[PDB]
């Protein structure tokens, strides 16, 4: 099956494609937002400015896809 060329989906490794796009961590996956355009993950506390909670919204788009 598929396996990431960067991290081999090894949970002991960082990956800014498979896990948080800003810190590459797998921690707190319930606080990592998925961008509905690029499907990258982002810790609420890695964003700048940071979010205090997961938005109550239908969809969310990351600063890169928003181009701001």
């Amino acid at each position: 099956g598929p396996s990431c060329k960067h991290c081999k989906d090894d949970v002991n490794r960082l990956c800014r494609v498979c896990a948080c796009h800003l810190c590459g961590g797998r921690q707190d996956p319930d606080k990592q937002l998925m961008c509905d355009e690029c499907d990258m993950a982002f810790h609420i506390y890695c964003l700048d400015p940071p979010l205090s909670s997961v938005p109550s919204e239908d969809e969310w788009y990351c600063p890169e896809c928003r181009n701001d």
Binding site: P2, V17, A19, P29, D30, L33, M34, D39, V54
Partner: peptide, 27 residues
């Protein structure tokens, strides 16, 4: 109510969809 990484990881179909997309991109 946005999707989290945990929501993806817990769903085998969502997880496989994400793996397939990453593999394709890395090609």
């Amino acid at each position: 109510r946005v999707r989290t990484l945990l929501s993806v990881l817990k769903d085998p179909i969502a997880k496989m969809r994400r793996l397939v997309r990453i593999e394709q991109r890395q090609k």
